[PDB]
Amino acid sequence: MQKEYIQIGNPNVFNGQYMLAVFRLQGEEGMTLVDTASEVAAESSTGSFVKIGTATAFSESLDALVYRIDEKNNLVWIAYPWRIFDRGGNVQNIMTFIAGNVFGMASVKVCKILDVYFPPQMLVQYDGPEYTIDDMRKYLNIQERPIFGSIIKPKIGLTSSEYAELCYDFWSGGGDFVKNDEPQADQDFCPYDKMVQDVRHAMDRVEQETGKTKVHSFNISSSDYDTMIKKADYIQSMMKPGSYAFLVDGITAGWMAIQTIRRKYPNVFLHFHRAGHGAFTRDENPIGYTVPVLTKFARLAGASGIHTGTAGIGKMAGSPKEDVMAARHALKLYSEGDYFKQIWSEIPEKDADLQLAIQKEAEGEDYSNLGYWRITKKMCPIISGGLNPLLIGKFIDTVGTQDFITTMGAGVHSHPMGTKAGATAVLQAYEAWKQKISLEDYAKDKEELRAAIQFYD
Amino acid sequence: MQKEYIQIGNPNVFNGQYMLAVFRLQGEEGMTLVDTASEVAAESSTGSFVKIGTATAFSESLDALVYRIDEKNNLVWIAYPWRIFDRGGNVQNIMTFIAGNVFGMASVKVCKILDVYFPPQMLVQYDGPEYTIDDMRKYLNIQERPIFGSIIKPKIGLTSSEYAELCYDFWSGGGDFVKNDEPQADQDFCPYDKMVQDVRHAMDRVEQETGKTKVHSFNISSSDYDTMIKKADYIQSMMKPGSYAFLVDGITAGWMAIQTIRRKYPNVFLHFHRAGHGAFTRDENPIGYTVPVLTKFARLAGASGIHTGTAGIGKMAGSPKEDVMAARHALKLYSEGDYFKQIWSEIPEKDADLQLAIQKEAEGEDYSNLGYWRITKKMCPIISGGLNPLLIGKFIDTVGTQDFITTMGAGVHSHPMGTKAGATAVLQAYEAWKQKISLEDYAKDKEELRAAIQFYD
Amino acid sequence: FPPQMLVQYDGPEYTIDDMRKYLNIQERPIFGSIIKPKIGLTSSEYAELCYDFWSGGGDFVKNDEPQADQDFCPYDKMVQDVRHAMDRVEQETGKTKVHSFNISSSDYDTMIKKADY
Amino acid sequence: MQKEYIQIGNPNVFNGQYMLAVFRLQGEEGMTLVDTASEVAAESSTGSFVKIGTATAFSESLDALVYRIDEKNNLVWIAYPWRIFDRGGNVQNIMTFIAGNVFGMASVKVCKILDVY
């Protein structure tokens, strides 16, 4: 046990100098919960496997503090002086501190970060989002309703032309948003430049035919940084402003890719695809961090949007509690975790305008105009994975909002009447939800929705 | 179940067009192993939760193939046409395919990659290492023995000057190698530029006093790529060539940072620190991929070295089996995984010179000069975590080689007589091992080793 | 100072009258505040107090004399946040405002950096 | 009296986060030495002539501390968290904190900095 990291009940951890975190910890045979907590606090801040002999009073003043313990639920509260984190809003460094070596410690059998708190003084040091769902809505000229999008399937194997065709068919069917599948890139059979050019041409045709703008999120994840920047610059040169978003495989490409795109292209929607996060977040893995934590850090890094899950309605792991908590972490000015209440404002909570905005948000009013110096911009939850027209309404009911992007892959492209019909089916299912008519009743005179009922049941 | 992805016994999977992988898979109750295998192969190549209606004959020719099943051990062999992977040797794209969304599938309760195979035709497409341990040996003018290094502790909180002092004390005590702790960067109290200048001055003093060269591995993990490049360029401007290495938090910063440093500074040792890998690799996490896999991909990306574990001797989770297998994956020309035999050569196995080199390696001879067009350069295992002078000999005995870097934090800086004494103690423990004298007997007239024995027992 | 001596020296160039023209207030004194505490606010908190003072009818805000580029109150962010706060006040009231920035620095190049920014 | 700046005997002043200073202080008639010390510590760090209502817990953690008093010799030992000083090694900013407004307070009759750590 390293007692130098144990200060149970210390009231100074709430003074704005500390980022707080809750771990579910369980050490090997012989270690108590507080012992495991002291060792984790040591390995996630200033120490190592034994008391550090070269420590100075200063470095000891920057120690992480285990300040609360719950033995029954194997919970531990640790406080991190965020001064120890790399400056310049380095988020990968935060994850290195709190989600780094502690996951490999042989003496820790369970190590799951369940919640984290960012004090306003800490929020000051980080980017936060810059282009929001509201900006995309402005470009698309669609208000209030969810943004309806698709993932082009198959995940890999189409040529650039076939890919642009599926884009055209989806948009032309009333769809608003198309994203690359996360691994689609510069494969020889699907040249990336030609993919961009064909997407542009297809978008021009849809805009001509319908008078409506559309949006495509391009995957720019690459081998190195030079290639990603090359792809992004090409897209900028080929697509009209607001008509394109930048998708990054955040987990496998890394937080640095996210922050770099956020800072280099602040006026472009940054689409944080989280392929691989399961190893961190899945309930079955006792070591890692949960999806709410991932989402809060993705907002901290500045992602315009991140996938937050379908609350168990689709095919990816999750329940209404965690996934809806994630969507609220992304959207709300005041969001509640399992253990910390978060206000996404760099201003003291006592401010009258802030409390007013919080009250107005509880009443349904927008806080986005509250002041660039006063809020962390909202981030967009992206709802994907096993969705089809039959499930969108259930999701809307579960999350309690319509401020999000849904993306459907096989839920659109496997529709018996084709992609265009699949997009029409999702729009008709949304109308069914909006008019409070059952999908069976509404589909009586909607052929596309009726076929979606046939295939997806 | 998606039958289009099951081709058990397909003899075309060994023809060099496919990267092979073994998963330990467990689906939810009601799903058979081949069912879970079909769904995993679908979500990791061309498909989704249901057969894709927009699929083409071409794209179906690029499907992943489940070609072998082991019901008893819940094992599944999948073949991925590496043509579907992003070009330019993109490793993050591979990891998105095979270790991405499949980790979030609600219907899969266990999904652990246990081994992977690279055919020569695939190896051609990737960087592999460029700066090796042999290059560092040349610079340090130390042959045969392990490279002895330290991690400066405390993990955070020292000023740039105090940090340089500990560097000086370790080097002056006979240590060869000093690395940043993984989160140390540009904290306000430890300015990065001043830290670099002080390291150069300390190194100059050691070289003056000893006539010996030294190496310091700097952490360049940053918020964005421009800051990392700024740090790298500064270090190049302040340190003599060969005297510095670049450390990157591969997991939290991302594979793109790794590949970018490899390609932009190929003549500098790339130190892949794997802070955070545990959530993927720990035995307790049923979802992820193992350490041998992580290491093989780190060699694919071109890391000069990666942490491979202490075989259970230290404090990080691991056994002799997996950790020694990882070190051999990093070092050898012919390395054995749990399920695949890997030859790190882009040349046909039948080649006489290649088989000769494999035999000569079995006899203890170096293959590094075999030809730049026919080998993937060797990668260096880095041995860290809870190590102290008492354990180094046991590690050398377990791994069966000396081509590695050991790094010790508290094993040096918590030594009762200080850092310089700790470095001398590790050197004396190595001398004890080399002469087949027990540490107990050797410490009789070696004061530093004697105090290390008393403190670390 | 005799008149022949005064010729050799600068004298002021920007006066209170120039600021009056910008502020569009005549006769009455210019009412301003020093953001307090003297040190310890983040750039956001600092801009919040600037907004609150201007919105209440104040014309002029000045840095406290030691406020600068402390790590917890980034100078560049402080400037941007003050700009946005002033923008909001101007939209809500239709009145212009003034902020006096402390450019006192360690050396001359840093002061010029701050001023140009 | 601004009591928030009085923490006599605080042992955390020796942890390296603070620059230390000794003043010879004498306030006007009616103010004790610890009174003059409270006002000087306030005006040389985070406060003013009265408690700052807009202060945050963060900002109060950066308060200067009068941690020692010598009544007989009119001496006061104050600790300044050097994190409040402008970065880039700004020395004029230190002198602005500790040798600035405190020299103009009407209520301080003697205010002499004698040593610093």
Ligand SMILES: O=C(O)[C@@](O)(COP(=O)(O)O)[C@H](O)[C@H](O)COP(=O)(O)O
């Ligand atoms: O590859 C896929 O499965 C998807 O394209 C969905 O396809 P379908 O519409 O065919 O289901 C999305 O990337 C996942 O939803 C991501 O998971 P998450 O949202 O949890 O990040």
Ligand SMILES: O=C(O)[C@@](O)(COP(=O)(O)O)[C@H](O)[C@H](O)COP(=O)(O)O
């Ligand atoms: O932070 C640490 O624990 C270390 O600096 C070791 O310090 P000590 O010498 O004080 O133990 C290493 O980074 C870890 O060993 C990395 O783990 P791995 O090698 O498994 O990647």
Ligand SMILES: [Mg+2]
């Ligand atoms: Mg996808």
Ligand SMILES: [Mg+2]
């Ligand atoms: Mg370390």
Ligand SMILES: [Mg+2]
């Ligand atoms: Mg030959």
Ligand SMILES: [Mg+2]
């Ligand atoms: Mg206010």
Ligand SMILES: [Mg+2]
């Ligand atoms: Mg003042």
